[PDB]
Amino acid sequence: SSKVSRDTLYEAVREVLHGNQRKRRKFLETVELQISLKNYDPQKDKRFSGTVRLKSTPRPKFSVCVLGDQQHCDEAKAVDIPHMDIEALKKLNKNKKLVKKLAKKYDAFLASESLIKQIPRILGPGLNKAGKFPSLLTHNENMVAKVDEVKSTIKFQMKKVLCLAVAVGHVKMTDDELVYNIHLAVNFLVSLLKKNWQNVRALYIKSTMGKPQRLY
Amino acid sequence: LSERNCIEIVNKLIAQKQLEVVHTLDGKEYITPAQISKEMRDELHVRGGRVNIVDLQQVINVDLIHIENRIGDIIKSEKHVQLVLGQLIDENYLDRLAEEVNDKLQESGQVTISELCKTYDLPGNFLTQALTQRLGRIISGHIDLDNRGVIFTEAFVARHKARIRGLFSAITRPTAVNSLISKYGFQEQLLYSVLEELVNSGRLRGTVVGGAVFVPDIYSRTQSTWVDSFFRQNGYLEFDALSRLGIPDAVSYIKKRYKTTQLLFLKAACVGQGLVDQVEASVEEAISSGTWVDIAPLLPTSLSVEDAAILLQQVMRAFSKQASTVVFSDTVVVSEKFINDCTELFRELMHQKAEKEMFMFQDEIEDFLRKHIQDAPEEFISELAEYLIKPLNKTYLEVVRSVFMSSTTSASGTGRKRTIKDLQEEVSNLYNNIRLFEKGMKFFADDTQAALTKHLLKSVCTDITNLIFNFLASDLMMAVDDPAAITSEIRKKILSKLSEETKVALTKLHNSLNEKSIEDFISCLDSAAEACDIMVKRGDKKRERQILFQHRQALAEQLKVTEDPALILHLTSVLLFQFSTHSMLHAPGRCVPQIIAFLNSKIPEDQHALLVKYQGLQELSSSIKDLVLKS
Amino acid sequence: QHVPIDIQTSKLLDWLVDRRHCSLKWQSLVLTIREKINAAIQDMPHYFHCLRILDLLKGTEYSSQRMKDWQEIIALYEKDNTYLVELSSLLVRNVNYEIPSLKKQIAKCQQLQQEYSRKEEECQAGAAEMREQFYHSCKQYGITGENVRGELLALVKDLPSQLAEIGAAAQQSLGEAIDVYQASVGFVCESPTEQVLPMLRFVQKRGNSTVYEWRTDALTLLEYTETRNQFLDELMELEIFLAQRAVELSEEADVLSVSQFQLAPAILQGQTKEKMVTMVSVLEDLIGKLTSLQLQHLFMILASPRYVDRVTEFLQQKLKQSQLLALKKELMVQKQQEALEEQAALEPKLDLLLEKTKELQKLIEADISKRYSGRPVNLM
Amino acid sequence: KKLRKLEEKQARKAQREAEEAEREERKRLESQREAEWKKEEERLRLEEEQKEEEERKAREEQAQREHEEYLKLKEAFVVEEEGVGETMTEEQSQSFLTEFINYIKQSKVVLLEDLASQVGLRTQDTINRIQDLLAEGTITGVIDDRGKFIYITPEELAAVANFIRQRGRVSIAELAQASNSLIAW
Amino acid sequence: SKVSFKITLTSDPRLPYKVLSVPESTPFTAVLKFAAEEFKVPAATSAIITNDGIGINPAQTAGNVFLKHGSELRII
Chains C and D touch (3+ CB pairs under 8 A): yes
Cα separations (Å) of B531 from A168, B415, B467, B496, B499?
Answer: 89, 18, 14, 17, 11
* Residue A191 with chain C: CB contacts under 8 Å: 255
Q: Is residue A190 part of a domain?
A: yes
Resolution (angstroms) equals 3.2
Among the four given CATH numbers 3.50.50.60, 2.30.38.10, 1.10.10.10, 1.10.2020.10, the one describing domain B93-208: 1.10.10.10
Domain boundaries, chain B: 4-83, 93-208, 235-332, 411-538, 542-630
B59 touches chain D (CB under 8 A): no
Q: How far apart are the CA of C3 and the nearest CA of chain D, in angstroms?
A: 27
> C-alpha A137: how far from its chain's center?
18
Same domain, A70 and A146: yes
Using CA atoms, how far apart are residues B187 and B150, in angstroms rounded to an integer?
A: 10
**Beta-carbon separation of B244 and C184 below 8 A:** no
The three-state secondary structure class of A120 is helix
The contacts of residue D145 (CB under 8 Å, 6+ apart) are B2, B4, B5, C97, C100, C101
Element (H, E) at B70: helix B64-77
CB contact under 8 A, A49 and B300: yes
Residues of C in contact with B167 (CB under 8 A): 240-241, 244
Domain boundary among A150, A179, A195: A150
Q: List Cα–Cα distances, B258 to B241, B457, B588, in angstroms.
A: 17, 93, 103
Instruction: Give, as one character, the DSSP assignment of residue B205.
Output: -
Cα of A15 to nearest chain B Cα, Å: 31
Residue B139 carries which DSSP code?
B
Give backbone dihedrals phi and psi of B31, rounded to 5 degrees, phi first.
Answer: -130, 125
CA distance B472 to B503: 11
What is the C-alpha to C-alpha distance for residues B192 and B177, in angstroms, rounded to an integer? Answer: 10
Does residue A145 contact residue A48 with C-beta atoms inside 8 Å?
no
Amino acid in position C130: M
Architecture of domain D90-182: Orthogonal Bundle (1.10)
Q: Residue A117: which of B241, B277, B298 has the nearest Cβ? A: B277
In angstroms, rounded to a whole number, what is the distance separating the alpha carbons of residues C67 and A83? 182
C vs B contact (3+ beta-carbon pairs below 8 A): yes
Rounded Cα gap, residues D10 and D13, in angstroms = 5
The CATH number assigned to the domain holding A54 equals 3.30.190.20
Kind of pairing, strands E72-75 and E3-9?
parallel
Distance from CA of B5 to the nearest CA of D (A): 6
With an 8 Å Cβ cutoff, is B296 touching chain A? no
Give me Rg for the CA atoms of chain E.
Answer: 11
Chains that touch A (3 or more CB pairs under 8 A): B, C
CB pair distance less than 8 Å for D83 and E17: yes
- What residues of chain A lie within 8 A of the CB of B282, using their CB? 120, 125
Whether residues D145 and C28 touch (CB distance < 8 A) is answered with no
Cα dist from B267 to A101, B230, B238, B271, D95, whole Å: 39, 19, 9, 11, 132
Domain boundaries, chain D: 1-74, 90-182
Q: Decide: helix, strand or coil at residue B385.
A: helix
Q: CA angle, corner B545, sides to B543 and B547, nearest 5? A: 70
CA distance B535 to B425: 9
Our count of domains for chain A comes to 2
Phi, psi of C260 (to 5 degrees): -60, -50
Mutate to test the interface with E, among D66, D69, D74 (most CBs of E within 10 A): D74
Q: CB distance from E17 to chain D under 8 Å?
A: yes
Q: Write the CATH number for A109.
A: 3.40.50.790
Domain boundary among A150, A166, A185: A150
- Asked if the C-beta of D81 comes within 8 angstroms of chain E's C-beta atoms, the answer is yes
Q: How far apart are alpha carbons B452 and B587 in whole angstroms? A: 6
Contacts by C202-205, CB closer than 8 A, 24 or more apart:
C203/C167, C203/C170, C203/C171, C203/C174, C203/C231, C204/C170, C204/C171, C204/C174, C204/C175, C204/C178, C205/C171
Helix, strand, or coil here: B263? Answer: strand
Which amino acid is residue D115, in one-letter code? Answer: L
User: Measured between beta carbons, which residues in chain D are less than 8 angstroms from residue B13?
Assistant: 157, 160-161, 164
Would residue A1 count as lying in a domain? Answer: no
Count of H helices and E strands in chain E?
2, 4
Angle, helices C306-346/B91-108, rounded to nearest 10 degrees: 140
Q: How close C380 comes to chain B (CA, Å)?
A: 28
May I ask the CATH class of domain E3-75?
A: alpha beta
Q: Which of B259, B264, B278 is nearest to B236 (CA)?
A: B264
Q: In chain E, what residues touch C20 (CB-CB under 8 Å)?
A: 71
Residues A51 and A68 in one domain: no
Inter-helix orientation angle A6-17/A177-192, to 10°: 120
Start-to-end CA distance of chain D, whole Å, equals 142
CA–CA separation, C47 and C70 (whole Å): 9
Q: Phi/psi at E2 (nearest 5 deg)?
A: -140, 160
**Is residue A117 within 8 angstroms of chain B, CB to CB?**
yes
Q: Domain-by-domain residue ranges, chain E?
A: 3-75
SS3 sequence, C146-207?
Answer: CCHHHHHHHHHHCCCCHHHHHHHHHHCCCHHHHHHHHHHHHHHCCCCCCCCCHHHHHHHHCC
Instruction: Please answer whether residues C283 and B166 qualify as being in contact, where contact means their C-beta atoms are separated by less than 8 angstroms.
Output: no
| CA separation for the pair A107, A64 (Å, rounded) | 6
How many angstroms separate the CA atoms of B48 and D34, rounded? 123
Cβ neighbors of B296 (< 8 A, separation 6 or more) are B308, B331
**Contact of chains A and C by CB distance (3 or more pairs under 8 angstroms):** yes
Write the CA distances from C180 to B170, C240, C264, C277, D48, integer angstroms: 11, 13, 12, 14, 156
Contact status of E8 with chain D (Cβ, < 8 Å): yes
Classify E56 in phi/psi space as left (phi over 0), alpha (psi -120 to 50) or beta.
beta
CA-nearest of B572, B476, B472 to B528 is B472
Q: CA B475, CA B465: separation in Å to the nearest integer?
A: 16
CA–CA separation, B186 and B160 (whole Å): 7
| Angle at A88 (CA atoms; ends A82, A91), nearest 5 degrees | 150
Compute CA distances B464 → B479, B532, C48, whole Å. 15, 14, 197
Q: Check CB contact under 8 Å for D176 and B34.
A: no
Calpha distance B412→B148 (Å, rounded): 113
Distance separating alpha carbons of residues A155 and A188, to the nearest angstrom: 10
| D128, D146, D149: best to mutate for the C interface, most C CBs within 10 A | D146
**E23 interface with D at CB cutoff 8 Å:** no
Per DSSP, the three-state class of B50 is strand
Residues C70, C50 contacting (CB under 8 angstroms): yes
CB of C336 closer than 8 Å to CB of C121: no
Half-sphere exposure for A93 (CA within 13 Å, toward CB): 1
Give the count of beta carbons closer than 10 Å to the beta carbon of residue C363: 14
Listing DSSP states for B315-383 in one string gives HHTT-SSS---EEETTTEEE-HHHHHHHHHHHHHHHHHHHHHH----HHHHHHHHHHH--S--HHHHHH
Phi, psi of B20 (to 5 degrees): -100, 120
Helix (H) or strand (E) holding E72: strand E72-75
Backbone angles phi, psi at E25, to 5 degrees: -80, -30
Cross-chain Cβ contact D123/C13 below 8 Å: yes
User: Is A118 part of any domain?
Assistant: yes
Strands A108-112, A64-67: pairing is: parallel
* Number of Cβ pairs < 8 A linking chain D and chain E: 47
CA-CA distances (angstroms) from residue C193 to C185, C187, C196, C231, C342? Answer: 10, 11, 10, 22, 96
Distance from CA of C101 to the nearest CA of D (A): 7
Which chains neighbour B (Cβ–Cβ under 8 Å, 3 or more pairs)?
A, C, D
Residue of B226, B243, B247, B278 to mutate, testing the A interface (most A Cβ within 10 Å of its Cβ)? B278
**C95 chain-D contacts, CB cut-off 8 A:** none
Please judge whether D84 and E22 are an interchain contact, meaning their C-beta atoms are less than 8 angstroms apart.
Answer: no
Residue A90: which domain range? 64-150
Query: Residue D15 half-sphere exposure, CB side, CA atoms within 13 Å?
Result: 6
Partners of residue B50 on adjacent β-strands = B89
Sheet holding B50-52, edge to edge: B50-52, B87-90, B81-83
Contact status of B5 with chain D (Cβ, < 8 Å): yes
Task: Give DSSP secondary structure letters for A61-98.
Answer: T--EEEE--HHHHHHHHTSS--B--HHHHHHS-S-HHH
Distance of CA A181 to the CA centre of its chain: 13
Nearest CB neighbour to B170, from listed C226, C244, C257: C244
